Every structure is written in structure tokens, then in C-alpha cells.
Write an enzyme that holds these catalytic residues in place. Sequence first.
Site, PDB file in Angstrom:
ATOM      1  N   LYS E  17       0.811  -1.226   0.000  1.00 46.19           N
ATOM      2  CA  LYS E  17       0.000   0.000   0.000  1.00 46.19           C
ATOM      3  C   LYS E  17       0.847   1.281   0.000  1.00 46.19           C
ATOM      4  O   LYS E  17       0.368   2.369  -0.345  1.00 46.19           O
ATOM      5  CB  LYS E  17      -0.963   0.002   1.180  1.00 46.19           C
ATOM      6  CG  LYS E  17      -1.852  -1.216   1.229  1.00 46.19           C
ATOM      7  CD  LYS E  17      -2.635  -1.416  -0.069  1.00 46.19           C
ATOM      8  CE  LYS E  17      -3.718  -2.477   0.143  1.00 46.19           C
ATOM      9  NZ  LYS E  17      -4.838  -2.419  -0.828  1.00 46.19           N
ATOM     10  N   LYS E  77       0.567   5.423  -5.014  1.00 47.93           N
ATOM     11  CA  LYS E  77       1.174   4.124  -5.267  1.00 47.93           C
ATOM     12  C   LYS E  77       1.832   4.091  -6.637  1.00 47.93           C
ATOM     13  O   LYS E  77       2.885   3.486  -6.797  1.00 47.93           O
ATOM     14  CB  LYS E  77       0.154   2.997  -5.141  1.00 47.93           C
ATOM     15  CG  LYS E  77      -0.026   2.534  -3.710  1.00 47.93           C
ATOM     16  CD  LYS E  77      -1.153   1.515  -3.590  1.00 47.93           C
ATOM     17  CE  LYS E  77      -2.434   2.052  -4.166  1.00 47.93           C
ATOM     18  NZ  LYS E  77      -3.571   1.800  -3.245  1.00 47.93           N
ATOM     19  N   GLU E 168      -6.647  -2.201 -10.311  1.00 47.76           N
ATOM     20  CA  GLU E 168      -7.696  -2.178 -11.316  1.00 47.76           C
ATOM     21  C   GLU E 168      -8.427  -0.856 -11.209  1.00 47.76           C
ATOM     22  O   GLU E 168      -9.238  -0.511 -12.070  1.00 47.76           O
ATOM     23  CB  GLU E 168      -8.679  -3.325 -11.093  1.00 47.76           C
ATOM     24  CG  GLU E 168      -8.237  -4.676 -11.642  1.00 47.76           C
ATOM     25  CD  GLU E 168      -9.063  -5.820 -11.087  1.00 47.76           C
ATOM     26  OE1 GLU E 168      -9.749  -5.600 -10.069  1.00 47.76           O
ATOM     27  OE2 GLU E 168      -9.032  -6.933 -11.653  1.00 47.76           O
TER      28      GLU E 168
END
Lengths: 219, 219, 219, 218, 220, 218, 219, 219
Positions: E17, E77, E168
Site C-alpha cells: 500500500k 502508489k 484495477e
Amino acid sequence: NAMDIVSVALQRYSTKAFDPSKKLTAEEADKIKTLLQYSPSSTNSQPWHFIVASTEEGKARVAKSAAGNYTFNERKMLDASHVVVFCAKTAMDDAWLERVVDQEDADGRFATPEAKAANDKGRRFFADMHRVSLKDDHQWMAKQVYLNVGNFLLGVAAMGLDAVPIEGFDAEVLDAEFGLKEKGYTSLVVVPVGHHSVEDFNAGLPKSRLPLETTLTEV
Amino acid sequence: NAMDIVSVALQRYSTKAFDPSKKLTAEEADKIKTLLQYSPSSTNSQPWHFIVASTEEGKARVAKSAAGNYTFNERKMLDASHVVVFCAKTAMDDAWLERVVDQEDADGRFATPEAKAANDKGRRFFADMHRVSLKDDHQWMAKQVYLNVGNFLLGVAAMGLDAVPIEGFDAEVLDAEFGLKEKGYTSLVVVPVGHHSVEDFNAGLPKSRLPLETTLTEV
Amino acid sequence: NAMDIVSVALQRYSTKAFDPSKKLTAEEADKIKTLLQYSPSSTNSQPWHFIVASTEEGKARVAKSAAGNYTFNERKMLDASHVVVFCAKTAMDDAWLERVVDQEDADGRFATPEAKAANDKGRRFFADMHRVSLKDDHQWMAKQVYLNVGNFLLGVAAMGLDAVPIEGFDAEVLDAEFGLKEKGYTSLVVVPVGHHSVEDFNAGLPKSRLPLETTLTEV
Amino acid sequence: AMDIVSVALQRYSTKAFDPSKKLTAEEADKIKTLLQYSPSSTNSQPWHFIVASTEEGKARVAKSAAGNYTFNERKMLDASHVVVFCAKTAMDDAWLERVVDQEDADGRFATPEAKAANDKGRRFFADMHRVSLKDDHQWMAKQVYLNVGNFLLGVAAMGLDAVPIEGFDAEVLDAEFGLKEKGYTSLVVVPVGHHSVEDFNAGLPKSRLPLETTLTEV
Amino acid sequence: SNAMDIVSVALQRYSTKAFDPSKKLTAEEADKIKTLLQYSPSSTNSQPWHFIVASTEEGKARVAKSAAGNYTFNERKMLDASHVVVFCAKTAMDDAWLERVVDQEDADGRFATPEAKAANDKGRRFFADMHRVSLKDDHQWMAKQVYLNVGNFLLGVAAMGLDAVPIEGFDAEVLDAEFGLKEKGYTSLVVVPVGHHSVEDFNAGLPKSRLPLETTLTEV
Amino acid sequence: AMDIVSVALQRYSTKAFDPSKKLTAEEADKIKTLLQYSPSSTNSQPWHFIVASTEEGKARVAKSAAGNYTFNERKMLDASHVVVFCAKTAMDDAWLERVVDQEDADGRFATPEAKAANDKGRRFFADMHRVSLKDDHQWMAKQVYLNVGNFLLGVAAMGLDAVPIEGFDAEVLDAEFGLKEKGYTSLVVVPVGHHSVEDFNAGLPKSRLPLETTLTEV
Amino acid sequence: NAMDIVSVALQRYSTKAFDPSKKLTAEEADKIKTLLQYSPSSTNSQPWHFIVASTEEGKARVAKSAAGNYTFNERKMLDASHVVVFCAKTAMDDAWLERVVDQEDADGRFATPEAKAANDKGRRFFADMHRVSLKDDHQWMAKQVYLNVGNFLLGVAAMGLDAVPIEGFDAEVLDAEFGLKEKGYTSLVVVPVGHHSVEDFNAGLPKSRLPLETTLTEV
Amino acid sequence: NAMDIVSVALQRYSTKAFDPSKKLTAEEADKIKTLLQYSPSSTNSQPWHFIVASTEEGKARVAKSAAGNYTFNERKMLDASHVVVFCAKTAMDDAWLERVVDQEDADGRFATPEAKAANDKGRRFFADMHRVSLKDDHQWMAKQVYLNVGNFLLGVAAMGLDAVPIEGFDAEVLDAEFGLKEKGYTSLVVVPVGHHSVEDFNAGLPKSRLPLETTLTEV
Ligand SMILES: [Cl-]
Ligand SMILES: [Cl-]
Ligand SMILES: [Cl-]
Ligand SMILES: [Cl-]
Ligand SMILES: [Cl-]
Ligand SMILES: [Cl-]
Ligand SMILES: [Cl-]
Ligand SMILES: [Cl-]
Ligand SMILES: [Cl-]
Ligand SMILES: [Cl-]
Ligand SMILES: [Cl-]
Ligand SMILES: [Cl-]
Ligand code: NA
Ligand code: NA
Ligand code: NA
Ligand code: NA
């Protein structure tokens, strides 16, 4: 509206005649007092008092200081809108030194009592140097008053007002007229403030100063 | 600030920590010299000389006047962009009076020979009162210098520069360093001019002055 | 010990075993927290958190970090009186930066809002430099933690306490046991504090250090 | 018996030093002793110090106070002694061997096995850093900060004023003293001496976050 | 040395994360991850895919633009990881690509005779036509091959000691535009930042969670 | 020795299995662990696995290899273990609850709030597929292929042989195991075991398109 | 479909993977049996038996022979339509010689009693050379069987069928599974027959044979 | 594809007399060599050599092997067009094992060195099992020669040619006449090929084979 202070310095001059009908606005009157209040001074000792005569009766009382050998200054003192007398403390006393530091404290300049005492010690060292060691505190304070006057002259010029510094006046007479000696002060310079009249031809003369080649050393 | 000079007066303060890498521009260097030059003075007598140190060797020489009791002032003399030493004449000589009137003449203040002579007589009226009657010309001239200082400190504040008026130095040592005695002058005030460093914490303190109720009398 | 601190520096050593029956006085326990709190750090950013374990149960939780490859340190963690875990913030967040300056303000370090603002700005500049330009904010904050450790080791020695810095522990285990990473911290050094056991010979081995000829350059 | 806590509560970062107040010869010997005898992981002592006490010397260090950091130049010039803390740039075997041999010469090992065991014990840690984590450089820099923390509290206890400076250009400083070639890099500059009467910070209360925020007791 | 303990690696990896942007991949790690992308199996070895590997700051920024809008929470990220991988599927299974694949298998020496090559081609084209003509299924069919690759990739980089996270949550339309993919015949499907977790990632220390085999597994 | 690229370049699709070479009991457990611990979107784990290891079992699976996929029968029968990968036919609320509750049981949530947020986070993604795009069936299918990919690489790394088979009748397979009613559908069959000496694909070189075609670097 | 036997020889090959869904027609099944029956053999001695497995139960029995080293041959035997086991007699017994000539007599090959007896004697000429002089009838018969296999492989190839000759099986197991030893036979070659699978690797490889320059001499 | 091979099987017979005026065409003679060459054999080991006699002098050399006890075979050997002697290798040497695999490699049956090496291993396994474990490599190879014979006899019958397999010759003499022993071969079967003469009444006799009830088990 500008930041052009040198233009002010090059445009101001000693007013030789005031228009007795042109008065300072209420706000301008406020500003000039602020200028007197906020001048710098050695250790911020503020060794001074100001009289601002704005009424006919007031300027008249000030004017009396011109009566003997200084009558040529009387008109300037009576015609100006406001007339400021710059006075110096006759002695630098512990009470005043305490008042100064206590005011700095009330204004919030010391975060600790240690800081305050360091400020007070610094000031008293200087002041004692003058009253005790050098015995020149009279002229030391007078110099602060003149620093104030330089500040003031430029300051009123920047406001668009006219002024002239006057040293020609009987200080003994002026002092007595306002009870200054009793109160602990002595008058030093008088500065009438207002707007020049059309009879002031000094307003239309070139400014003159000695050249830097004479007065300035670059090192 | 040729307008809102009061904000300038409320916003200026004595800088203690100069950033030594922030120089005055060439334009600003010229303007400060102009302020020095164009200060008023009694009878426009300009009884002064200025040393402006802007090189490291030059500032170091001035800084030597801060040894002993005044070591804390040395850094401000060294780190400021420009350092100004205000000097007063030691005696009001006839030659200086002749020089001032001749210059007023070259600058076009007198349309006729008699206007010049009148001006000359009028100046000497004051000069002689000090040189002869009161015997206080040394002090009289030093006060003119302080008027100049007052004018300067406000001027530079208006230009957006930082400064401080320093009395804490050895005038004897400074005079000797620049051979002022033989030249006819004596140093009175040192004013470092430049930009404050992020560590000049006087910039974070509020200003403190006595209230008008104490220092002001209206009539 | 104020004054003869060098003797203190030469007496302290890295304790190899603690006497499990000798506890810090309640007073000493406060002192050591003050030591942790009052350590300096870059811009006073105080990027750290401490766990002080003093109960059997508390110490056993910390000692878990010594359970795998670092069992040679398990006894120190269990037998010492007070075991301190030093932790670095895992990021210098805006909220913390705000928290720090608000605390300085509450503590009376700012005379004006301009002062608070300049201090906030300067600190944020440095933080951003580390996070954004250098991308070394973790190493930067860990360094401040080690500075704290140094201050601490000398500090407790001057109090007459024994202590030892431990880097041989599982920080993943220790973190998870206290939820440190989810709280925005991570453990760096463990430091047991107490009194050394009679069996710790090292208390009277000679101090050994590289000669100054090797590690010091004087100019 | 201290009183080291008062020292911690009375000390602060001096911003202006009196250029006329010097450490005594004895004081100057003691700050070196402090630098030398600081703790470090495995006693690896991965450091070098430069101590500038002359005007030429301080001026050299002062070059690093440039650009955004010119405000720090004056500290470095006015202070009596200016200490530069440097970390080694790599933990080399020769240094690990140097440390253990110095321990041996100082009589820390009663037998040859004690020496050997100490050596392996140090290498256990060294290798974790230079082989497994590949963070030896950061590891050594941390030891240097440990020393700094030690130092600041030491000199305060001697009655000396100081301040830890990170605002200097390490590249300039490294070049001025040829540290890269020598295997070191500068990390912290600590001017040491006595504060000026005009030191603002001496007039300010200390400030720290409360323990309620930073401390967890268990 | 020790046997490969792949199950051990499956048990240690996790979805990262927070990445530490100081910890970059080595140049060898970089080339290896590209071999992983290449050598993934796929139905019929049809390799219906394209990969974008962003390693530069400018590069990751272009990719990160896909995280704007409803996916701003994925932006950090994508910026902080050493390397970012965009997995794309082909838009169509065209004869050209079928030909390209079968010829590559020829050039690699998988066919001893023209008869072997022709049978291989016929077999592949059967499957392909079944999907694109009969089942009307080809986009999904190709998307699955790309996901298979992702699974191969996630396990692989983990084995190399790297951290990654399959994303995604990004704008495919935007990402495609940024790289003119529709025109080149591809569409973006998954973004995978790769690098090392920072001490800000508390997830690295959390127990893994999976439904028990008793729910997901029927032995027979 | 862990070099996974080496595994990638050495693995291949096995066509012929040695029916006499079985998985160890420990290898059987391991492959189960691979299936279980595969990653998936939001950890939604939208899958079910059938692991056939008995002759009766594999034959039931093998029935799906009829008509056009007759050539795949032998692979399913001759392998040690045959895995059938299945996806959920719909993402239902009860499954989302089951996942988060399990994460909770496993201690992934420090607070009730952290759990609630994890739940919302998952449903944010679930609803994007269930409600908006209406493509949850395909979404879950893709998670299954991810698992397939993870699995193929894992078993190779274990030293096992395998092949991903799509050539089978999914309707037949589903009916044989009653999947539809249970809520699943089969997508991929992967026989796992050891190649026979007549598995010739083991003698062919691997072929992939060149990076020049398939990789853009920025 | 015109006869081109050399084409058949060049196109045939050993199939490794059979399609279990492709069966011989009923007619093809009769035909392969005719092939087995009508193969030549020395003196028409026909020293052989055939197992033809066409049921899953049948082939499973034959596939048992493929264990240990040869488990790889099991799927061929299971997947093929028909699996043929070629078995040779284990001795040339008088009863068999009598059986053969009686059969030839029943088939109308002999015009006269002399003819029959001449043929009988002539067969024994050879039979006795083997079982009496050389004592090698076991090998002799097994050769006839291989002759039958060569005839068979080419025959089924001509029928459009795929096949492979298997020596890789356990004869002892296969024998026992069918009680052949007691019946007077032993298995020698297994020939799965049917149609190749799309995944038959060998079908996409070139035939390889040594060049004639090596294997053939012309005179 | 679906050629009528059974018809060929049912029409071929062991020629008892050849027409000495009938010769194989050059194409027929190329074909039969192909038949010999392309025969399958265990692991494709091709353990054989062929002598094809087609000249008067060549056939007479082969016919020397029919002198002595086998003169009843002499005419077939002399009157046929082409006479083929099938020979087996006396030993399966590493050299031959290498030649075979290298030829498969030259024929491009191996995609990688891995494939080749495995094939070579598989074959050597089998070979070693015969030459070493079972000690039957002579018989093993002789069986392959017979397989070839069986393939040939159907092959040539399909080409419309007549043939007869002959065992009744003296292999020692035949070997000696071609120096076979030193070459590592031994002669096993002689097959004259050509067209039968009108006088071979045997061409039109019914074929005789045992019934399947005796020779075939169906499961
Ligand atoms: Cl008024
Ligand atoms: Cl000022
Ligand atoms: Cl120490
Ligand atoms: Cl040394
Ligand atoms: Cl060294
Ligand atoms: Cl503080
Ligand atoms: Cl602070
Ligand atoms: Cl507190
Ligand atoms: Cl398939
Ligand atoms: Cl019988
Ligand atoms: Cl075989
Ligand atoms: Cl017959
Ligand atoms: Na010096
Ligand atoms: Na103090
Ligand atoms: Na489980
Ligand atoms: Na029987």
C-alpha cells in the site's frame, strides 16, 4: 501613491511662508503624532515631549518665543496649520528608564523576565555611561530629539505637507510659557507644519547640497 | 513610500542580524548616498561627512570600532551590505560657511549678488550665535548629523531596506582608523544597511512606544 | 552530572547484564522521561515516540523482539528496571508540523503572528526538502532519534544509572506488538535502564577508543 | 547525583556567539574527549571529526554556509570551536580490524578467543548492514548522530553554549576538506563557545511536545 | 544451495500500500521482470498483450494520470514505486497476429516440418475463431490471458524479493489516450507498481487472510 | 536455489503425463496452499477449486474432454492431480461479508472502524461491477485466471509439470459436479504431475514474441 | 484408391498418441484379422497366436504389461481402437506340423496322396533342422512372427490406419495375464492400431533412415 | 488412404519357379530398395545390410549358397530378376548407435540438443538391455531383419512382383562369399524377386491358412 522616498527627499524644502487658511485634515493630524511617537531613539529611551499647537491661541503662545531676537520667525509660527515643539528630558532618571522597559513589556517584547532584565540592564548600562561616566546625558538626549526631527521632516514631506525646522527662538521663554522646566523638559526645535503660500518663492528654487566628492568617502 | 509613510514608520525596526549575501543593488547604493546628501540641516550648513563601507576590507576597518564593550555590534557591521558612518565637523570654520553659500549659488538659488550676500549674512547670524555667543557649535553640528540619521533611517525603511543606528562603538578608535581628527570630523553614529537574515528575531517583536497621553501635549 | 561530565562519559559503559532487583526510584523514572522529552532535534520537529516498559508484563512485550535471532539481548530487556523503545515517525505530516508550532506558541516563543508564521514556514521548508527534493525523510527522522539516544545515554549515566543501546532486536515483531506502523511510527533502538549486575565484569574494563590521531583533524 | 536534568532544561540552541569568548585550553581538550569517547554500535566508531578553532579554520568550514544557508555563516565564524561530525562512507574490513586491534591493545580481551569472539560479534552486525540490508552508510550516520546527542549534552554540562547545524552544504564542506577521497562525509556542524548578549533564543522558554503525546508507559 | 520454497514466497507476499521511492530496482531486476512478462504462458501461446513499463518520473506521471477522477486514491502508489507496469490486452485477434505468433514459433524452431507448422496454425485458428466468430467472446478471452500473466507476474516479482500491488482502480479510457493504445490495437487492463514497501506500509506486517479450504476446495 | 526467471524459462505445457508418478502428500498440500493464497481484487477470492486425485475423480473431470476436446482426456487421466478452477457466477453480498469477516478473524483490523472501511472499500469495487458495468461475472473470471497464472508458476517452482486446459466442455463439467446450483462455473483445468519420457513438447524450445513488439518502456 | 505401396512406406510412422474416439470400422476389423492370418511364414508353418483387444476391458488386460520402465506405453494400448498381441509358439510340436498339412489338404492344395506326404516330409526337413540339429526352433518361430509383424505394419498403413510396434512391455506379465505359457505361446510384440490424435508428436516429424550407400550392396 | 491391400495379401504366394526372361524395370528396382530402406525397426536401430543381386555374375555368387543341401532352391536364385540377401548385424556397436541418432539429427527430427540426447538415451537403454542384461542382441536384431522381410514381401507383391523367402541356404558359404563376417554382418534370408513362370502351377492354387478359431483370441 508611491515607494519613491528619494523623490520626496529631492522635492521637499524649508517652507518660508504658510497659507494660514490651509489646514491639516483630521487624519493628517493623527499621522504626524504617530510619526513623533514612532521615531527611533537610542535604546528606545524616548527622552522627549511634544507640544502640538493647532489653535490660534496655541500657536500664539508658542509664537511668543520669537519675540526678542527672533521676530523674523514669528510669521511662520502663526501662519502654519500645526506647530510642533520638540522637547528633551532635562535628566534621564530611573523612573523614566523603568517606564520605558515596563511599556516594552506591556507591548509584549519579552517572553521571559530574564529577557526583560537583560533589556533593562543593557539600557541602564548605556544611560549610566552618559549620566555618570561621560556626564553628557543632556546632549545625548538632545541628539535623540534631533533624530526624531529628521524622521519627522521626511515623514511630513512624504505626506504632502510643508514644514520648516526652527532653531531661532528663545527656549527660556517657551519653556516658561509651558512650565517645561518644572515638568522635566526643555524645548529644542519648533516645526510649523501646513502648506506653503504663493508668496513662498523657496518652493520654486532648486535644492542645493555639497557634492558627494566632498562629503562622502567610499571604502 | 512617497505615500503611506506611516505604515513604513510602523513597520520598521532595528535589525540585529544581517544576511551577508543580500546586497543593495547599484540603484539602491546610489539612493542611500542621495538620502545622506539631501538631508536638511540648520541654515543648510551640512556640517557632516559620511563614510560608506561596502567592501569586506572596508567594513572590517569600521568593525574595529566595536571591540571591548561593543563586541556584539561587530557582526552587524560585518554582515550588512553597506555600512554608513555619520560624522560631524569638529568646528564651524569660515571656509565651510563660504563653501555652503558658494554652492547654493552654483545651484542657482540666488538670482543676484545681493541675494547671495543676504543669505551669507543670515547664515552667519546663526553660526556666530553658536561659535561666539553660546560656544556650542560642536554640539550644534552633531545635532544636525542626528537629524540626518533620523531622515536616513526612515528613508531606507521606505526603500525596503533594513538598518540599525549604532551608538555602541568606540568613536576614538573609529576616528583614528579613518584619520578623521586631522580631517576635521568625528564619528557619531554607525548605520549598517542591508537585509535582515531569517534569524533577525527583532523582526518578530512588536514595536513599543510610550503612549501619546504621556509624551504629547495639544494646545 | 552537571560540570564533571567528562568523568561521567569515561565511567559509563554498555551494560551486559542488569541486576533484576534494582529499580529506578519514582523520581529517577520522571527524570528519564524529561530526558527523552527535552532532547534537541532538527527544527525542534521532535519526530519520535517512546515506549517506556517498567512492568514485568510491559517488558515481556518488548522482549518479544528479542525472541528469534536476538536472544542474546533477551535478558537485558527482562532484567533492567525500565526499558525504553525509541521510535521515529514514519512521515513528517502536516498535522505534526502544525502540532509542533502550536506547541511552541503555547509555550510563549512567539511575540507576534509574523514570528509564528516565519517559524512555521522555515520548518516546513526543511521538512519538504527532505520528503520531496531529497526523499530521505525517514533517514532524517531516524537521525534525530539517534541524537536523542546519545543525549539519553549520557543523561542516565550522569544520574548514576546503567543502560545500553540495543539494535539487535526484531523491529517488525516489536512494531506489530505495539501496532507502531499503523500509528505512523517505527521502532529503531531499545535501551534498557537500571543497575548492572555483580556478574557484569565489563563495568570495570578499561574504556577503548581509537586515538585522536586517527579520528580528529584540528584546523 | 547529577544535576543533568537541569542541564537539559537550561540548554538551548545558541544563534549568536560572542566572538571574543574562547574555550579554555582545558575545555578544548574536554570536547575532544567527549567526541572520542561517545558510544556507538559495537563500538565501531565509524566517524571523523574536524575541529576548527583558528579564523582560517573556521572560515574554511564556513564556506559550507552558502546559498540558502548563509545565515549560518556568522555562527561558524564567531564561535570559539566549530566541530564537524563526519560518517565513514563505507564500513570496510580494515576499519573493523582496526577497532578490534585497538580494543586488544587497550587490554579488553583476557585471551585470544575473547578477541576473536569480539571480532565475529562485530562482524555479525556489520554484515547485517553491508551485506544483507545494504544500509551501512545510513547505519554509520546514525552512530554519528548518537555522538552529536552525546556531545550537545556534554558541552551544556560544561557550561558551554552550542547549536547543531544541518543547514550547510555537505558537498562543499566535503570538498573543502577532501573527505570523499578520505572515505568520509560531513553530517552536522556544531559551533561551540559562549552566547552573545544579543542571543535571542537565550531569552525564550523551551518548548517540547507533552509526554501525553509522545510517551507510552507499559 | 537450498531448494526453492515457492509456497514460502506465496505466504510472505502481500498487496503493497505504500512504496519507498528511495528504493529502486536494480538494472538486473529490471530486465528480469520483463522476462517474466514475456514468458507468461497463454492459451494457444497467443500472447494477446502489450506491456508498458514506466521507470522514469516523467513516465510514472503519465501513467499516474489514469488515477485522476474517481481513482485519486491510487495515485501515490503509482508515483512512489520504482517501476510501474501497465498490462494491456489486444483489441482484436487479427489474422496478422495469428500469423505473427505462428511464424515466431517457426523461427524459434518448434516445427520440424511444414505439416507440423500448418497443424499448429489450424489448431490455433480454430480456438481463435471459436472465440471471435462462434462465441462472440474474444475480448474477454484475451483479457483472461492478460490476467493469467498478472498472476504469473505477481508471484514472480515476489520471488525476486520485490513488492508489488495489482491495481484495477484506474481510468482505462484515460490511460489508453495517454499512450494512444486504441490506435495501436490495445487496451489497458491492470496497473502494477513494483519496488519496495516503506515503513509507512503497515500492511506488510499484517497476517494474511484467506477463506479456509473447507469452503473453497472440493477434493475428489 | 531461488531464481524464478530460470523457472519461467524452463517450464512448459506438458502433453503427456506419467501415470505412475504421483505428488507426495506434502506436495499435494502445497498446491492446495497455492490455490488458496493467490491474490485477487480486494481479496474477494471469487473462486472454487476441484482437486481430482483418484481414478474415479479424474474420470469424472475427464468426461468434459469429449467431442472436439478428446485429445485432452489422456492428460486429465494420466496426471497425478487435476485442478478445476471455477469462478463464482455472481458476486453476492453474503460472499463480501464472508471475506471481510475472515479478514477480521485473522486480525487484519485494529478497530471496528478499520473493518467497516475495508468493507466499504470492497463494495466500492464490487458495485462498480455488480451495478454499474454489469460485468461481475467476467471480473471474477479474471481473478480466477490470475490464480491460474500464480498456480502455473508455483507448481513449476515446485518441480512439477502441468498444463492449462481451456479445451473442455464447461457445461459438461459444471453438470458433472453440480456447479451451477452451488453458484460456480468452471473455467480452466490444470493437470499436474510429471511428464512421461514421451512428452515431446519437453524437447521443443520455448517461443515468445520479442520484447521489441510487446514492451513499451518509459 | 490406386495402389502406391512405396508412398505408404514413406508416409507411415509409429503413432504415439491415439484418438480414443476413433474406431476401426467392422470391415477394417475383419481386414486386419485377414492380414494376421494370411501372412507368409517359413513352410507356411504359422507358428503363432494373436490376441486382438478391442474392448476397454480387453485393452486394460493387455495394458497391464506396460508397467515399471514401460508405463509410458499404457496410454497407447488404452487409447487405440484395436490392440494386437503377436505371440510365437514355445516349441514346434508334431501336432502342429500335422495340423498345418491337414489344413493345406483340406484347402485343396494337394492333388495326390504323394503330394500331401511330400509336403509333410518337406516341412519336417526344415522343422527338424531347427528342433533337432540346431536346437533353435524357439527363435525360428519367433522370427516368423516378426515377419508377420512387418507384413502387418505395412498392411494396416495401406488401409489408412495408424499403428506402432511395441517391444517395450513385460512379456512375463502379458503371458501370465492370458495363460499363454500353458497354452503353448509367448507374447513378442504389441501393436496398437487405430487413428492418431491431433497431438501425435511423431506425425509432424520427418522419417529418418540410413542412406543406401551404407546399407545396400549391389552386384 | 484406403488401398486394397488385403487383395494383395490374398493373391501373393511363395513362387516356386521364376521366368528367367522377365526383369524388374529400373523404377521397380529403385522402389524395392526404398522398401528395404524404409522398413521400421525397434528404436529405428536398423540393424541390417542388404545385398541385391541383379546380374548374372551377382546372382551366381548368391547361388553358391544353394549348393550342397539346398540345390532345390538353386533355380529360384538364378532365374529371378533381383535377389535380395537380408543380413543382420552381428553386434550392436556404440558406433552404430551413434550413426543412427546422428542421421535422425541430420534428418531434422530433433528440435534441441535436449531432444536428441533423450532419444539417444532411450535407444541405448534398450540396446544395453539386450547386449548386456538379456544377452540376446543377436536374436533381437535378427527379429528386426525378419520384420523387414515381412514388410518387403507384401511391399513387392503390392508392386505386382513375385517373390519367395528362402531360409534353405548355407549362410556360412554366403557370408564367406561376401566377406560379411569382417563387415559385421551375417546373412539370414534370401528373397528372389521377379515374375513367376507359366510353369509355376502353384500360382493358381488356393491359399491355405489355419482358421482364426485356432489362431486368434478376441477380447
Ligand atoms: Cl487635530
Ligand atoms: Cl533602523
Ligand atoms: Cl562514554
Ligand atoms: Cl586507529
Ligand atoms: Cl582502517
Ligand atoms: Cl525549545
Ligand atoms: Cl524550540
Ligand atoms: Cl509534559
Ligand atoms: Cl487446450
Ligand atoms: Cl495342434
Ligand atoms: Cl517401445
Ligand atoms: Cl498357401
Ligand atoms: Na587564529
Ligand atoms: Na541564561
Ligand atoms: Na485452511
Ligand atoms: Na489353458
